[PDB]
Recover the amino acids of this structure.
RNA sequence: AUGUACAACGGGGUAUUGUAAGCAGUAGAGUAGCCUUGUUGUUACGAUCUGCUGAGAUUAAGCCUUUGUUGUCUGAUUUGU
RNA sequence: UGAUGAAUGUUACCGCAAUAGUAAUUGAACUUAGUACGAGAGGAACAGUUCAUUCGGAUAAUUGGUUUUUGCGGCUGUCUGAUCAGGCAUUGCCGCGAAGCUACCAUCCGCUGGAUUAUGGCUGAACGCCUCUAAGUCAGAAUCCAUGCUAGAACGCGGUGAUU
RNA sequence: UUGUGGCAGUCAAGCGUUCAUAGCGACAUUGCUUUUUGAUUCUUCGAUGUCGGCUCUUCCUAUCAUACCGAAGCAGAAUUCG
RNA sequence: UUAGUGACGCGCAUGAAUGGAUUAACGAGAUUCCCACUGUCCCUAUCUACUAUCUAGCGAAACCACAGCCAAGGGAACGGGC
RNA sequence: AUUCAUAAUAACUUUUCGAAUCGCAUGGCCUUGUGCUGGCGAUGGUUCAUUCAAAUUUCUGCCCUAUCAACUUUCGAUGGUAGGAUAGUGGCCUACCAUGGUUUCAACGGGUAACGGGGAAUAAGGGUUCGAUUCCGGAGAGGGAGCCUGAGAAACGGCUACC
RNA sequence: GAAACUGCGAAUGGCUCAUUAAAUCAGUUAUCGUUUAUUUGAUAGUUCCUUUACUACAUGGUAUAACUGUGGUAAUUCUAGA
């Protein structure tokens, strides 16, 4: 099986090809939002605790929230909802999914960390991806920094230097 | 192996124990026992049958599953820079914000500038 | 024929069934009568519903098990290289 | 067909095994192989594997059936002043229903060695050759007999214990 | 008893492209069986319950299939004879 | 589909009050097919009461040369006896 | 021709609109302040009217058939009252009520190699026949049903199901 | 200045004539019985709601896409996770 684990503060993410079939039998019959023990799955993950975010089973059909079963279903989905993007306004659509219970049918299980255990993880905690963008709005910058109502966000602006050739500029 | 759930009673069906039914519409039902099977053939409603899990959960009996939703009593705790602002100098200028005579003097400069602007504009208009 | 003895009851378990009677209800189609005519108004009747209640009942008779209780435990006949 | 049983000195236990009976049967599929063979057309086989047909012998975990558990619930009519709880209705009727019985309607199992026939042969004369035969001799079948399985001679037997 | 019914042999004119016998085998002929049908009337008329089917066992083989084999006008498959 | 029905008719031997040809309705009439239904059946199983069974008590009858093991033989041609 | 337009009293609203939008140009007063004012536009925005539409609607008019003369109303057919729905009237639908309504002046039913019309061929006149078919109005997207989005679809080169 | 958010439009066009015989349609009326985006012409002094601190108006809050990357199906204009 695979565990697509993520650490959201570091913004990091990695897949882990898991075996120890019984240390994933623990994951069996589990819902979304629930948090089980890193040590229980793996002493390499000793002390850690994750949260079962979701996952794709075979045939790539994701895990959807709220349905409360492991078996697959055909839902007449609509906008503002996971597992369907509408290619037109108004289009509802019947699509197949898998539900919010964990079992062998799954192939990749998506996890998020809420607490960092005692040891350190190679591709999640030792690393941290930066914030790709800076806040583009005045007050968002202003409150992000904690300056004032009048501290000139215009000069607190972000400047991201890049070189076209040798001419360089922050754009 | 796996264990499953009676359509009617909603009970674990250990392997072999029990019957299975496949309606013409390809709906696969499972029954732990001929009791459930016979009721199903009678077209009964388990939500009305009392000993069933559906009635149990519809009348809210044995409700030890749900507890509450947790809440954190704090903030995000990141007054960080925006990757192009040098957070040290950012906090330094945030602290220089009070005692605002600097921005006030810049305003006074641009203010006398607007004075002279209207003056010279009227001069050019004349 | 005085014991890790036996038996009848009781208990526990396991199973079957489907939520006992009794009480209560600001539940109840409503119909009549009360008046301080409410804002649950009260009263008589009224299937049925809900809570106590996966409650109650039955459970070896050819189910299992008992630290329990109460008892029982020398009557007859025959047999020889 | 099953079932008892006097008598053997008594009684109990463990055994032998005469004799009799006997059972396992056939096919398909994949592979061998689109190979061999065949000009082409078409088209094999032995071994191996998985399955089934027929028959048999058991068993009841599962599923199904059966239900006087007259166990639980409900239903009609009527009687017990009403309720509670019950009687009668040739087991009143329905639904569930354990246990037990039971089903190719369910499941499990169904042995390997020898002598042989037919047939093909080895050496080999008669018949100075030759010949499977005449003396001798090899392999060989759903055959035959044993292994195995069933009963155990009630006048077949043995070993052992205790014997007032 | 066995004409007739049925079954199997001897012989081999011929058929089989040529060749009687791989396979068939007319004309002639020797036998067998009693599952037919006759013929007979021994027993049975002071009664042997009388067709078929159903059920169920057992037996014969003149073997339809299956086991092993031989022959072929058997290349293989399929088939035929034994 | 030797059945059933509709046609054909050198009809062994159809036929007109020895009544012919139809004929609604009716039939515990004979017959065929279809729907339903089903333990008739594939294929049997299970349950109940009364029996059988054992007991106490009561207590017949039919039938009977003598009696009661098989094979073959011959024999009144199919014996329990020889 | 109105209970019209429109105005006011009294309240209702889970609360509607009343510019936090954008490009150019930068203009003027001095109370010398980033003070105050200012232009040409785009976008959107409540109401009314307009325009392109849309839906309903009045009179008249349609081929052959009586080997179709009674038709409609159970469970809407005709009307009325009240209400619901509609964007809106109204059996559009419901509750209740009266029992009516169409018919030889051909109802109703059947058939149509019938979508209709503007028009085409053909002729002295009269006329007969055709007209799917370039323009107009309708219907449909394989048959049916349903519906979301939207001002506008019962959309099909959009969704849902069944066939 | 791709992609993406957003706003428009995708209900026009085009194709066929299956349907349909007071139905469509044609002329002719009405909406004093209705919706109408869009255009076009006009049109929001009155929005502090214990209306005094209850509230920045040189102006307020929230994602979320695109993207970063983890990726999952054999396949989908398939999509989740951070």
């Amino acid at each position: 099986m695979k565990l697509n684990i993520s650490y959201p503060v570091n913004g990091s993410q990695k897949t882990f090809e898991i075996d120890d079939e019984h240390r994933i039998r623990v994951f069996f019959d589990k819902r979304i939002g629930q948090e089980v023990d890193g040590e229980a799955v793996g002493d390499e993950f000793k002390g850690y605790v994750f949260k079962i975010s979701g996952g794709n089973d075979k045939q790539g059909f994701p895990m959807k929230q709220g349905v409360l079963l492991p078996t697959r279903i055909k839902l007449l989905l609509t906008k503002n909802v996971s597992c369907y993007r509408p290619r037109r306004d108004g289009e509802r659509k019947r699509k197949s999914v898998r539900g919010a219970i964990v079992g062998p049918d799954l192939a990749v299980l998506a996890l998020v960390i809420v607490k960092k255990g005692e040891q350190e993880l190679e591709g999640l905690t030792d690393t941290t991806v930066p914030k790709r963008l800076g806040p583009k709005r005045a007050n968002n910058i202003r409150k992000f920094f904690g300056l004032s109502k009048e501290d000139d966000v215009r000069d607190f602006v972000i400047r991201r230097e890049v070189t076209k050739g040798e001419k360089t500029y922050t754009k | 192996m796996k264990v499953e759930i009676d359509s009617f009673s909603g009970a674990k069906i250990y392997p072999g124990r029990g019957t299975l039914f496949v309606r013409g519409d390809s709906k696969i039902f499972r029954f732990q026992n001929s009791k459930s099977a016979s009721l199903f053939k009678q077209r009964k409603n388990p939500r009305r049958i009392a000993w069933t899990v559906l009635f149990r959960k519809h009348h809210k009996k044995g409700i030890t599953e749900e507890v509450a939703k947790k809440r954190s009593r704090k903030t995000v705790k990141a007054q960080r820079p925006i990757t192009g602002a040098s957070l040290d100098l950012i906090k330094e200028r945030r602290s220089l914000k009070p005692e605002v005579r600097k921005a006030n003097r810049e305003e006074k400069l641009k203010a006398n500038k607007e004075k002279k602007k209207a003056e010279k504009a009227a001069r050019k208009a004349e």
The beta strands of chain A are 2-7, 12-17, 49-57, 73-77, 93-97, 106-115, 162-163, 168-169. The two ends of chain A are 44 Å apart (CA to CA). Residues 20 and 64 of chain A are 26 Å apart (CA to CA). The first strand of chain A starts at residue 2 and ends at 7.
